[PDB]
């Protein structure tokens, strides 16, 4: 029956995300989405009894890296939205890696694992953009970026997190597929049109 496969099969919603991120020269972000696609697939593959036989690492590892991978995918998407220069880019990328690694270890299932990154990312983004709005005396990312990346990306972000943290209580089988799909579209829509630092 389809409900066995649907949580595993819907993990391939990130395959568009990695394909698009690679085409836009976001080669690091493409790793983090590809890594997440792999560990989210095998995290669900072990749980479903009828295909649990195929997966080859212990539940502890695939569980950790499905959560960590997702939380870091949100982080590198948001640290790609706010383009930073080399010393700040490399620092803030690594700040996410080290924070999310500890957060995923310390309380694996707690909403803190996503709240920490999304809160810190939003603070870093908003402080950079408010400084740039004060410098230019105008809406810094053009209205075109707000209406076609930030607005849609965060709209899918709210949808994904409300599917995960509310409506997963009503059903797991279809809602967790809608979650994989919704969140894969946030990781597409939050990315800029080109990786400017690729030159």
């Amino acid at each position: 029956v389809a409900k066995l496969l649907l949580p595993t099969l819907s993990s391939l919603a990130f395959l568009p995300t990695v394909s698009i991120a690679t085409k836009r020269r976001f080669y690091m972000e493409a790793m983090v989405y590809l890594f997440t696609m792999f560990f989210v697939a095998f995290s669900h593959a072990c749980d479903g009894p009828g295909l649990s036989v195929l997966c080859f690492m212990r539940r502890d590892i695939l569980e950790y890296f499905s959560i960590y991978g997702t939380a870091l995918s949100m982080w590198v998407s948001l640290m790609a939205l706010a383009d930073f220069d080399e010393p700040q880019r490399s620092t803030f990328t690594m700040l996410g890696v080290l924070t999310i690694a500890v957060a995923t270890f310390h309380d694996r299932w707690g909403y803190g694992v996503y709240s920490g990154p999304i809160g810190t990312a939003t603070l870093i983004i908003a402080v950079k953009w408010l400084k740039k709005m004060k410098e230019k005396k105008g809406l810094y990312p053009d209205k075109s970026i707000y209406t076609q990346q930030i607005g849609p990306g965060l709209c899918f972000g709210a949808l994904a997190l409300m599917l995960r943290f509310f409506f997963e209580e009503w059903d797991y089988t279809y809602v967790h597929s809608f979650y994989h799909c919704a969140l894969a579209m946030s990781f597409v829509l939050l990315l800029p049109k080109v990786n400017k630092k690729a030159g």
Partner: antibody, heavy 120, light 107 residues
């Protein structure tokens, strides 16, 4: 509607200071994030930006000429005033004033533009 | 301030033909170009207020493209109303800088 109109002396001597005045309607420079700009076409040249004045009374001048521009504003009449000092034959130009917004930073309404010539 | 060059200083184009203007900036200006139609004896009109974003009430023939130091302005099947002088404005810095302007003429 949005409108701006440029008024000044037109014909005058070199080695003098001229007053250029911009009057506007459909908006007020008292509005949050609003700005008025001054720009001129020198005779047969490409366009040259001169000055900005903003809702917050912040001001900006062209580095090539900044020693001889003084911008100012009046939100009671809805007017903006620019003075060019020590005027010279290079200032034989059409002068324009234009409304910059907050949502998009490039000016989106220009006035009709007014001729300036300095001669004996 | 960042100097810009519009490649053609003047263009001769057929009524109902395509025409394009290339603008080259002296530095990367982060897609903050706007394109203006200066019809002689009148104040300029804003056509495009980012690299590609048209102003509302502008006919769909007008379009722009390019990114980082090289941008293009385009008209598809131009009308006799479109005969004007066309300027690009760099507006990345508050030190606003124009190109030299392109005088389009009917063939």
């Amino acid at each position: 509607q949005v409108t701006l109109k440029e008024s000044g002396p037109g014909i005058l001597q070199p080695s003098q200071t001229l007053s250029l005045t911009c009057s506007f309607s459909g908006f007020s420079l008292s509005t949050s994030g609003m700005g008025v700009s001054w720009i001129r076409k020198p005779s047969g040249k490409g366009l040259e930006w001169l000055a900005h004045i903003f809702w917050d009374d912040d001001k900006r001048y062209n580095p090539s000429l900044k020693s001889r521009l003084t911008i100012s504003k009046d939100t009671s009449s809805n007017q903006v005033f620019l003075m060019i000092t020590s005027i010279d034959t290079a200032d034989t130009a059409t002068y324009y004033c234009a409304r910059r917004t907050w949502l998009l930073h490039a000016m989106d309404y220009w006035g009709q533009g007014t001729s300036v010539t300095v001669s004996s | 301030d960042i100097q810009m060059t519009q490649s053609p200083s003047s263009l001769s184009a057929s009524l109902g033909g395509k025409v394009t203007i290339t603008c080259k900036a002296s530095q990367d200006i982060n897609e903050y170009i706007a394109w203006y139609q200066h019809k002689p004896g009148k104040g300029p009109r804003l056509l495009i207020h980012y690299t590609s974003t048209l102003q509302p009430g502008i006919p769909s023939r007008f379009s722009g493209s390019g990114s980082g130091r090289d941008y293009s302005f385009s008209i598809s099947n131009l009308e006799p109303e479109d005969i004007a002088t066309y300027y690009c404005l760099q507006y990345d810095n508050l030190l606003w800088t124009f190109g030299g302007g392109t005088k389009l003429e009917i063939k």
